[PDB]
Structures are given as structure tokens and as C-alpha cells.
């Protein structure tokens, strides 16, 4: 049974000609298997999303997007920690990675932030992250 690592590496592989649903979805499934999947999965995604290689970053955010839709409380709750959200902020701030990150990637992140503030009202740290970007001019 594929480790989360193996899985994420197939789903975000910069060699990929198209999106790989077998592995995007096997990743969401597997993270949901163990108590500790959600923290690990969230750690692995943050690294990939900060990749300087764009298709890596882009496929990573797809996986993020997918698992937020289909997974439950436990996932949503690891994502809506500042431990994870702060990593998404580093990518969109010019202060941090913002300046040599494509608009593609930064616009993807912001769009996801927004939809989860509407989709997931209870993840209140997500609201706060987004209001912070909004109030700073990034949004």
C-alpha cells in the first residue's frame, strides 16, 4: 500500500503530461486511512506547493483542492491550522516567495482560500488568513 510520499510523488511528478487521478485520489484515500495521515499529508503538500518548478506546484494544489472536497473533518482541521496556512502565505507574499512565484500559482492559492471560507465556515483560521491577505492588498 503506497506511502503518502510515494503517492504525492506520482501525483505531482513534473514529468506528467496530464493530471493523474489514480494518484491524486489514492492520496486522499490513504491520508484518511491512518490517524496520522492528515498531519503528514499536510506537511508533504506544503513542500510541493513551494516548488520553484511550476507544474509540481500546480499539481500539488490540485491535490490539496481535491482532498478538501472529499475528505472530512480531520483533514479540513489540519489544513485550517496556521502551521499549514502560513506556508500558503509565504508563497503569495512578495516578502517571502511571492516575487518569483508565477501568478498562476498565487492566484490558485487565493482562489482556494476564498472558496474554503465559503465552503468551510467553521475553519475560522482560514477566514483569518484570508482577511489578513485581503486587508494587506494581496487579495
Amino acid at each position: 500500500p503506497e506511502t503518502l510520499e510515494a503517492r504525492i510523488n506520482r501525483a505531482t511528478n513534473p514529468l506528467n503530461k496530464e493530471l493523474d487521478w489514480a494518484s491524486i485520489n489514492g492520496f486522499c484515500e490513504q491520508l484518511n486511512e491512518d490517524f496520522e495521515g492528515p498531519p503528514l499529508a499536510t506537511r508533504l503538500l506544503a513542500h510541493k506547493i513551494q516548488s520553484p518548478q511550476e507544474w509540481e506546484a500546480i499539481q500539488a494544489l490540485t491535490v490539496l483542492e481535491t482532498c478538501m472536497k472529499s475528505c472530512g473533518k480531520r483533514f479540513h482541521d489540519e489544513v485550517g491550522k496556521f502551521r499549514f496556512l502560513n506556508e500558503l502565505i509565504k508563497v503569495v507574499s512578495p516578502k517571502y516567495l511571492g516575487s518569483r512565484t508565477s501568478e498562476k500559482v498565487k492566484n490558485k492559492i487565493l482562489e482556494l482560500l476564498y472558496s474554503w471560507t465559503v465552503g468551510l465556515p467553521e475553519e475560522v483560521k482560514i477566514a483569518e488568513a484570508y482577511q489578513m491577505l485581503k486587508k494587506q492588498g494581496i487579495v
Binding site: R83, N86, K95, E128, A129, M132
Partner: peptide
């Protein structure tokens, strides 16, 4: 586990 505090910026 904790968790962190929000960034400013």
C-alpha cells in the same frame, strides 16, 4: 500539535 501563530505579512 499546537498550533502556530498567524504571520503578519
Amino acid at each position: 500539535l499546537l498550533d502556530d501563530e498567524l504571520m503578519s505579512l
